[PDB]
Amino acid sequence: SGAIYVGNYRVVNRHLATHNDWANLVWEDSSRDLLVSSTTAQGCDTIARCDCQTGVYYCSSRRKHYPVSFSKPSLIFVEASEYYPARYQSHLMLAVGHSEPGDCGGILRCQHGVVGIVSTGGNGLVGFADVRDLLWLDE
Numbered sequence: 001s002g003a004i005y006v007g008n009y010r011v012v013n014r015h016l017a018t019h020n021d022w023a024n025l026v027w028e029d030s031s032r033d034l035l036v037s038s039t040t041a042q043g044c045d046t047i048a049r050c051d052c053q054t055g056v057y058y059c060s061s062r063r064k065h066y067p068v069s070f071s072k073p074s075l076i077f078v079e080a081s082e083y084y085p086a087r088y089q090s091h092l093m094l095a096v097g098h099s100e101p102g103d104c105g106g107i108l109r110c111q112h113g114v115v116g117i118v119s120t121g122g123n124g125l126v127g128f129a130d131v132r133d134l135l136w137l138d139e
């Protein structure tokens, strides 16, 4: 679990969105596993606007932050689950590192700010849904 709070927005994994997230929907994309809902309270997370390929992510299954090199946002094949059939997930970045299903929502950050959130994993790899291209999160 986990979310990004920026201005009047809350960004979560789409497969983990609540009834309240859907009742206050701003934008959602199944192919990216992202959902953004509106919030009354003001968020103060800074989103990065960069092309970094190094950062630090939070791994709740180990209660630790890990430094990682990660790939550029791309279309990557993802196995079926109770949330999606087998498909390509776009805007996805991979790194060598530990993750478990409950790790989704953990933030990936670089020196510029929030890069994305954990969205997939397995076989010693962790996948992050990128948010740096969503320029509207700031306005």
Ligand SMILES: NC(=O)[C@H]1CCCN(C(=O)Cc2cccc3nsnc23)C1
Binding pocket: 015, 033, 078, 081, 083, 084, 089, 099, 100, 101, 102, 103, 104, 118, 119, 120, 121, 122, 126
């Ligand atoms: N975006 C998707 O389609 C997700 C939806 C939930 C299931 N999923 C996973 O990757 C499950 C998983 C297993 C093993 C380590 C994991 N670390 S994070 N998620 C992990 C795919």
Ligand SMILES: [Zn+2]
Binding pocket: 048, 049, 050, 051, 052, 110, 111, 112, 113
């Ligand atoms: Zn950066």
